[PDB]
Write a protein that holds these residues in place. Structure first.
Motif, mmCIF file in Angstrom:
data_model
loop_
_atom_site.group_PDB
_atom_site.id
_atom_site.type_symbol
_atom_site.label_atom_id
_atom_site.label_comp_id
_atom_site.label_asym_id
_atom_site.label_seq_id
_atom_site.Cartn_x
_atom_site.Cartn_y
_atom_site.Cartn_z
ATOM 1 N N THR A 155 -35.661 -33.063 -8.818
ATOM 2 C CA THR A 155 -34.633 -33.911 -9.414
ATOM 3 C C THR A 155 -33.247 -33.277 -9.287
ATOM 4 N N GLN A 156 -33.061 -32.446 -8.260
ATOM 5 C CA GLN A 156 -31.829 -31.665 -8.167
ATOM 6 C C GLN A 156 -30.608 -32.553 -7.927
ATOM 7 N N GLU A 157 -30.740 -33.581 -7.077
ATOM 8 C CA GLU A 157 -29.606 -34.470 -6.819
ATOM 9 C C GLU A 157 -29.179 -35.203 -8.088
ATOM 10 N N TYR A 158 -30.151 -35.639 -8.898
ATOM 11 C CA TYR A 158 -29.848 -36.269 -10.183
ATOM 12 C C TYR A 158 -29.052 -35.336 -11.094
ATOM 13 N N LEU A 159 -29.510 -34.087 -11.230
ATOM 14 C CA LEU A 159 -28.846 -33.110 -12.091
ATOM 15 C C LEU A 159 -27.441 -32.767 -11.602
ATOM 16 N N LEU A 160 -27.229 -32.720 -10.283
ATOM 17 C CA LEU A 160 -25.882 -32.439 -9.782
ATOM 18 C C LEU A 160 -24.950 -33.625 -10.021
ATOM 19 N N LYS A 161 -25.472 -34.854 -9.920
ATOM 20 C CA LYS A 161 -24.659 -36.032 -10.224
ATOM 21 C C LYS A 161 -24.297 -36.105 -11.701
ATOM 22 N N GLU A 162 -25.192 -35.672 -12.592
ATOM 23 C CA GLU A 162 -24.848 -35.643 -14.009
ATOM 24 C C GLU A 162 -23.750 -34.617 -14.289
ATOM 25 N N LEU A 163 -23.784 -33.468 -13.605
ATOM 26 C CA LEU A 163 -22.684 -32.514 -13.751
ATOM 27 C C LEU A 163 -21.366 -33.097 -13.247
ATOM 28 N N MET A 164 -21.405 -33.890 -12.165
ATOM 29 C CA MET A 164 -20.188 -34.540 -11.670
ATOM 30 C C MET A 164 -19.563 -35.413 -12.748
ATOM 31 N N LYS A 165 -20.392 -36.204 -13.434
ATOM 32 C CA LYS A 165 -19.883 -37.100 -14.466
ATOM 33 C C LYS A 165 -19.287 -36.314 -15.634
ATOM 34 N N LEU A 166 -19.928 -35.207 -16.028
ATOM 35 C CA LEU A 166 -19.415 -34.402 -17.141
ATOM 36 C C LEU A 166 -18.094 -33.726 -16.784
ATOM 37 N N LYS A 191 -27.168 -27.367 -20.233
ATOM 38 C CA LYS A 191 -28.540 -27.864 -20.192
ATOM 39 C C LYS A 191 -28.906 -28.330 -18.788
ATOM 40 N N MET A 192 -27.948 -28.924 -18.064
ATOM 41 C CA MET A 192 -28.219 -29.357 -16.696
ATOM 42 C C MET A 192 -28.438 -28.161 -15.773
ATOM 43 N N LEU A 193 -27.623 -27.108 -15.920
ATOM 44 C CA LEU A 193 -27.822 -25.889 -15.133
ATOM 45 C C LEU A 193 -29.176 -25.244 -15.417
ATOM 46 N N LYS A 194 -29.616 -25.270 -16.677
ATOM 47 C CA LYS A 194 -30.911 -24.701 -17.026
ATOM 48 C C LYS A 194 -32.037 -25.418 -16.294
ATOM 49 N N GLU A 195 -31.935 -26.744 -16.169
ATOM 50 C CA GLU A 195 -32.964 -27.490 -15.459
ATOM 51 C C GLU A 195 -32.923 -27.219 -13.960
ATOM 52 N N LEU A 196 -31.725 -27.078 -13.383
ATOM 53 C CA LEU A 196 -31.628 -26.732 -11.965
ATOM 54 C C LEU A 196 -32.263 -25.375 -11.685
ATOM 55 N N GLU A 197 -32.063 -24.418 -12.589
ATOM 56 C CA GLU A 197 -32.569 -23.064 -12.374
ATOM 57 C C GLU A 197 -34.088 -23.043 -12.241
ATOM 58 N N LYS A 198 -34.791 -23.912 -12.971
ATOM 59 C CA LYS A 198 -36.246 -23.979 -12.866
ATOM 60 C C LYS A 198 -36.740 -24.572 -11.548
ATOM 61 N N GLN A 199 -35.866 -25.141 -10.724
ATOM 62 C CA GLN A 199 -36.304 -25.751 -9.470
ATOM 63 C C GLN A 199 -35.870 -24.932 -8.252
ATOM 64 N N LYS A 242 -27.835 -18.424 -13.299
ATOM 65 C CA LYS A 242 -27.774 -17.743 -14.590
ATOM 66 C C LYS A 242 -26.365 -17.246 -14.897
ATOM 67 N N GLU A 243 -25.628 -16.790 -13.880
ATOM 68 C CA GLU A 243 -24.257 -16.353 -14.138
ATOM 69 C C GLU A 243 -23.346 -17.530 -14.481
ATOM 70 N N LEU A 244 -23.568 -18.689 -13.858
ATOM 71 C CA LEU A 244 -22.778 -19.868 -14.208
ATOM 72 C C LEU A 244 -22.981 -20.248 -15.672
ATOM 73 N N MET A 245 -24.229 -20.183 -16.160
ATOM 74 C CA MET A 245 -24.491 -20.482 -17.566
ATOM 75 C C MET A 245 -23.748 -19.517 -18.490
ATOM 76 N N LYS A 246 -23.693 -18.229 -18.134
ATOM 77 C CA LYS A 246 -22.960 -17.265 -18.957
ATOM 78 C C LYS A 246 -21.467 -17.573 -18.994
ATOM 79 N N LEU A 247 -20.898 -18.000 -17.866
ATOM 80 C CA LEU A 247 -19.468 -18.312 -17.835
ATOM 81 C C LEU A 247 -19.142 -19.544 -18.676
ATOM 82 N N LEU A 248 -20.030 -20.545 -18.692
ATOM 83 C CA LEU A 248 -19.786 -21.705 -19.547
ATOM 84 C C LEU A 248 -19.841 -21.326 -21.025
ATOM 85 N N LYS A 249 -20.735 -20.409 -21.402
ATOM 86 C CA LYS A 249 -20.778 -19.971 -22.792
ATOM 87 C C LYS A 249 -19.490 -19.249 -23.175
ATOM 88 N N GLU A 250 -18.923 -18.471 -22.247
ATOM 89 C CA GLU A 250 -17.641 -17.829 -22.527
ATOM 90 C C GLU A 250 -16.520 -18.853 -22.673
#
Lengths: 33, 33, 33, 33, 33
Positions: free
Chosen positions: B1-12, C25-33, D7-15
């Motif tokens: 579901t990687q394309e879906y997750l990247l599109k959701e990041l685009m919207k955010l 949360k979206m990045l966390k899901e990408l990381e698992k794939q 994982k590094e991207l997630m840390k930067l968003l938390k900062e």
């Protein structure tokens, strides 16, 4: 397709940088008051 | 579901840009007084 | 007034925090794939 | 690696969230003045 | 005091820009993969 979407995300972050620099210029105007 | 997750990041990220532009409108009003 | 505009800026920053949490949360899901 | 970068991207968003919370605090201090 | 607080807000936005530049670096390496 994933690489294309990653390039779109980088463009959107560059736009955020441009707007933050505009806010800094406005904060400097407020600092003169 | 990687394309879906990247599109959701685009919207955010687009929503973040909108909020930064709304903040600029308020800083301009503050500078006027 | 000055007070009105500062409070509106606070609300917009709180909305940006909400969106950043969704981005994590979206990045966390990408990381698992 | 892919895992390292996500994982590094997630840390930067938390900062970023921590900086936004401090921006809110500065606006509240400005409001008191 | 108001001038000190406005200068601190400028520093926080400059720190945001640095984090966004670091995020772009990470997305650039993901795009190459």
């Amino acid at each position: 397709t994933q690489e294309y979407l990653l390039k779109e995300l980088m463009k959107l972050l560059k736009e955020q940088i441009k707007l933050l620099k505009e806010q800094i210029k406005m904060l400097k105007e407020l600092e003169k008051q």
